[PDB]
Design a protein around this ligand. Structure first.
Ligand SMILES: O=C(O)c1ccc(O)[n+]([O-])c1
Ligand SMILES: O=C(O)c1ccc(O)[n+]([O-])c1
Ligand SMILES: O=C(O)c1ccc(O)[n+]([O-])c1
Ligand SMILES: O=C(O)c1ccc(O)[n+]([O-])c1
Ligand SMILES: [C-]#N
Ligand SMILES: [C-]#N
Ligand SMILES: [C-]#N
Ligand SMILES: [C-]#N
Ligand SMILES: [Fe+3]
Ligand SMILES: [Fe+3]
Ligand SMILES: [Fe+3]
Ligand SMILES: [Fe+3]
Lengths: 233, 200, 233, 200, 233, 200, 200
């Protein structure tokens, strides 16, 4: 089984969004009022699942064929997963989900008037390679109106889930697209207090990775908590 | 002081988390292999139990769009990290609350004991991470069992919780569902009887 | 018939794109080498057609229904038409055309692999009102790969044609969307030498004109040559 | 000096101009009313003629994606600005070159004489604006008729063209197409015999 | 009756003071803990009363005559009411109330030791003209001590109430006087987080509107939510 | 993006609001024409009702300096915007709570049904705006009637409130005062049973 | 967007390029092993051909200081990248024009067919890079054979050239020199009949 060999860099709870961020209404009632209780790292926290043996389908990472071709801006989303130290995270699970080109999600609860795309599902997954690289192929999602303020619109975004080496590193986040005028207006985005942190969530147009006359590409690198060896414990 | 690269910031999972992490629930066709709520196969060693609970917000209302991830040791107190559907037991699982009842279920086996970094044994426990719309960063918690009182009393983790009354919030209550041993673990995100949440 | 009452402000051929702009390959062979011959304004040049009596269809200006609902980002494109003096241009003809959400045009010659949208045509037209205001409803087009340099992509854009009061004011242009990272890279865009002029072609996100939970809006005002009365001629 | 608001900059019409301005050509269904290449109804006063031509680039190759707009006076030398499909004659029209032959056609009537600002008569002429992919800003030109020599010689506009040889480029050649009077007007965008283009 | 022909720009709740501003002690127990529920605008929200036929007395807007001459600095408070689009708001109701020269209000509950002024009431009302102009004649109010912190003093102010075209535009605010050193120290003023918003509440000395050898004048313009016609609804 | 002029920021009404908006209450002489709490003249069509209630702060203490404004449709579901003391019915009204008992009252008629922008009918309601010392920006709410249950269940507005328990906070409880139909509508600004406030 | 390291900018080869790349031609002693104009040893499989041509400037004047590099597949349509003077066939070669006559020559075999990225076969061709004084960045072209007409018509590369007249500029004209199969391929850098140059 797994073993307690590692220690992870303590999270900076001032970098990440706070629990209570009133402009984002739902956080009011879904945020604790008591302080988190700090605990030392043990095997329980320093280990996590390895998805190396999960049976991945041929098009698990290709939203263009995993669900006719979808209507929308063909894009490749690629990048690398490293830790705070710059060390790559090989064979890690990356999962993503998004709405269609119009901003409609293939989910029961979504009642937005934009139509579903008969050829689009919105889910992808893949394992990072030895160098910590991942890549997906999809269509650029559209902005989505939501019940927050009377005229709130989510910028185009893709939901991301990354495992990392431990449950301590597991992260759920969102990717935004470079230059989207909606970004600076979003209360969800704004849950993050440091503008430098916000910059970390914007994927940059990547012409070097684009497929001429085919599809464009976006670069999105993800940084997981630094992993160090224990010492003098 | 020294500075490392900054960790990518967390963002809420959103209300549609299910399309991506719980296909069935989204009401979408699943793939060949999915990470779900069944950690143990009938033939897995250890005491088979059913875990169930509800999630409450600050107003006492059910959180029906919550997503949970669990990490636990096997019956022998060993973390089984190689995730595989062939395994008789997997240390990792996923579950979500129903849009109706708003209840989650997990089929597993009671975890054996594991020691902390200083070599002290921790009472049997399940590590939980909760995600949902309105939650900017996931919440960490532990599920302990009410029938492990002797162990619970001595747990180095539980003992870090300053107020004894707050420790009680981490203890699942033994019950029976269809004549099967079960433990109920309700999560109160905010307010009265608010569940202890950890930072590590 | 029409009459020679007006004079129009001379065009600034240094503001507009030049004829020969080599990065845009097609201009090499399609640009004159002899200087334009300047001529004084006469009735021939100072008059133009009036489209007040043209029979406009009910959905001429609604690309969402003028062709099932199209897949893509529902947007309203509105703005006003004024002259150099700030004077509105009422009852003027505005025409626009674009590709679909994926970047595919409903034109014979377009062979891009992105699919056509069964519910989208791509053409709109309308007359400006008494205040010089126009408005259209469509979907936001996608970027389009084209045979220029080996990896050239047109930013998302809508083609515009505006009549104005005379043949002297008639203009054909293109609208670009605020924050599009592709803009600064386009050789067509770059045909324009003054960055201040480029700014005139970018439509700005208009939250005040958006329809909550429905569609977003973009503002695009157009300025036509100033019209003055003749004096001491 | 004084500065006004700056005019919105021009941009090429692009290769697909047809989807928007010449529906038929794009090979798309047209609308009830379309502005096309027929300025005159059979019952329009004046001499009915057919105008046709080709557009050449700098290498002598045909420009098959060109879009043209025309503005002319009626037989009486009067500009009919109220555009209406009911009209027997419209001063305004549109045409485009075929993707095959690369030839445009226009059905109209020979324009009557109009005076310039200084009261001097200008020879019969058609005002043309040419648009296409590769053209950043449209090109202005005039179509004059070879059978109006006396008039042409005295035109205040034609006479502004410094070199007599360059004036010749604006003169359409009389011919017959299906036994119908026609005038051929070829446009050479660049190079040898390059058509005079105006700025006004 | 009234008709649902308008939509009003969504309010900027980050511009306006937030509900909970602890330095203003009373806001602590008088601010909701739950998030506001956004609703679409309907006829209920886009209509409001018209005070055109309200029978205004002759000195309704003249505090010098409507209650001997009051003691204090005689001034005229005038300005214009426009919406966010800069459009005038004609025939709208403006009501004002304030303390006397010494900071004493003519109210049961005011136990401040500064005496009442026998010739002053402190209430005015009037209707904006065709051009959205309003004007009042009064005396400059005095600062008032209040039980907040142990030594809090309200800057000299005038309370204002404006109806506008609908209940969506109705607003209650306060006018402050240019250069008053108390402004920046006041907890009620500071409930407004953007210093730029604070500036909008300061009435500027207006020498051009002053009556020589008689009274000074202050200019205070008011901006109500922008009104626009519905489109593609 | 585009930016308009910013709206003038709100400020609290203050404790002495009465001097300007509820003259009588300030204990000051009124003017000839005052906007007050009687929307309907006894001879107005519809069902005459008396409305009353208290306003509570987060400590459950009465708010005795509160000021309210109301807007409703007549018995036919029409909004009478031309305000006049002559009319038998006015859509607009004003009230305030007593410095003593701390209760407000309103004399009107039960509003008829109005449709929303989509054409769906809303249950009969009264739009209320609440102002007071300690309230930086006024609070918007709606008053619904307990005896219009069938309508309330289908109100598109009421339905926007996620939690059904929160909907109940907008329902006035019918009764009778002096043999007259009365509806009691208490407002809890903060805490347990906090009333739903809206943004539009 | 993302930015990589910029590539080192090109500079003209200059008039004395020969000293470094065409030793003999500089009139300098060669080294043991030199990269030259003989791709095929007489005993190499395929059809042996002799290639020759001139290079003209925009004035139609010969460019006598030009330097060329070639890349082709063997007779089987395979690229032999391991360069060795021993091999009977090398895919890579170098040539230059005479300071006198101004003609270049190459001794090779006719290349077999290769497929493009899409799997469509390209007509037999030789990839050429041209360097010289006055050439800031080298020019890329392809040499096709006049006797492979059927193939040429279907070449996906040749087909990318819009104007058919421009395609002809890449076709070498078969002949015979000393009873050996020869193909003459003239390059016109600028002007009338300017050869198609590529970007990749
Ligand atoms: O309510 C939320 O938190 C929410 C709603 C829509 C959306 O797309 N995302 O990402 C989040
Ligand atoms: O070649 C051109 O000029 C061109 C190609 C594509 C496109 O969309 N626009 O606008 C222009
Ligand atoms: O407590 C308050 O809110 C207060 C007290 C005095 C005053 O003059 N104003 O405006 C407000
Ligand atoms: O004409 C030339 O291009 C030239 C002349 C001399 C030299 O040294 N280099 O490098 C180049
Ligand atoms: C978002 N779900
Ligand atoms: C672009 N046509
Ligand atoms: C002031 N009240
Ligand atoms: C140096 N040539
Ligand atoms: Fe989302
Ligand atoms: Fe285009
Ligand atoms: Fe006050
Ligand atoms: Fe040199």
């Amino acid at each position: 089984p797994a073993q307690d060999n590692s220690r992870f860099v303590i999270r900076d709870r001032n970098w990440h969004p706070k629990a209570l961020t009133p402009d984002y209404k739902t956080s009011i009632a879904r945020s604790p009022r008591q302080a988190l209780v700090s605990i030392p790292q043990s095997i329980s926290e320093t280990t996590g699942p390895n998805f190396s043996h999960l049976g991945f389908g041929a098009h698990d990472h290709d939203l263009l064929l995993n669900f006719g071709l979808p209507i929308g801006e063909r894009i490749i989303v690629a990048g690398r997963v490293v830790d705070q130290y710059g060390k790559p995270v090989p064979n890690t699970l990356v999962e993503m989900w998004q709405a269609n080109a119009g901003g409609r999600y293939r989910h029961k609860n979504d009642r937005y008037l934009a139509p579903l795309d008969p050829n689009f599902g919105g889910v992808g997954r893949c394992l990072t390679d030895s160098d910590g690289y991942y890549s997906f192929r999809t269509i650029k999602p559209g902005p989505y109106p939501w019940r927050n303020g009377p005229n709130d619109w989510r910028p185009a975004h893709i939901h991301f889930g990354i495992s990392g080496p431990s449950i301590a590193t597991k992260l759920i986040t969102q990717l935004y697209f470079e230059g989207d005028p909606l970004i600076p207006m979003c209360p969800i985005v704004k849950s993050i207090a440091n503008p430098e942190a916000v910059q970390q969530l914007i994927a940059k147009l990547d012409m070097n990775n684009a497929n001429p006359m085919d599809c464009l590409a976006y670069r999105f690198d993800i940084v997981l908590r630094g992993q160090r060896k224990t010492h003098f414990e | 002081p020294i500075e490392l690269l900054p960790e990518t910031p967390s963002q809420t999972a959103g209300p549609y988390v299910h399309i991506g992490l719980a296909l069935e629930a989204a009401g979408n066709p699943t793939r060949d292999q999915e990470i779900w709520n069944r950690l143990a196969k009938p033939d897995a060693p250890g005491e088979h139990i059913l875990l169930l609970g509800q999630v409450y917000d600050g107003n006492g209302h059910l959180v029906r769009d919550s997503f949970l991830e669990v990490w636990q040791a096997d019956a022998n107190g060993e973390y089984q990290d190689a995730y595989n559907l062939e395994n008789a037991f997997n240390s990792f699982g996923r579950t979500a609350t129903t849009f109706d009842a708003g209840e989650w279920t997990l089929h597993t086996v009671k975890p054996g004991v594991v020691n902390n970094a200083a070599g002290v044994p921790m009472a049997p426990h399940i590590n939980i991470s909760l995600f949902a719309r309105g939650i900017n960063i996931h919440l960490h918690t532990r599920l302990y069992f009410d029938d492990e009182a002797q162990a619970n009393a001595k747990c180095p983790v539980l003992n870090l919780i300053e107020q004894p009354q707050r420790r009680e919030t981490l203890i699942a209550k033994r019950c029976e569902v269809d004549g099967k041993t079960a433990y109920r673990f309700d999560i109160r995100i905010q307010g009265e009887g608010e569940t202890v949440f950890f930072d590590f």
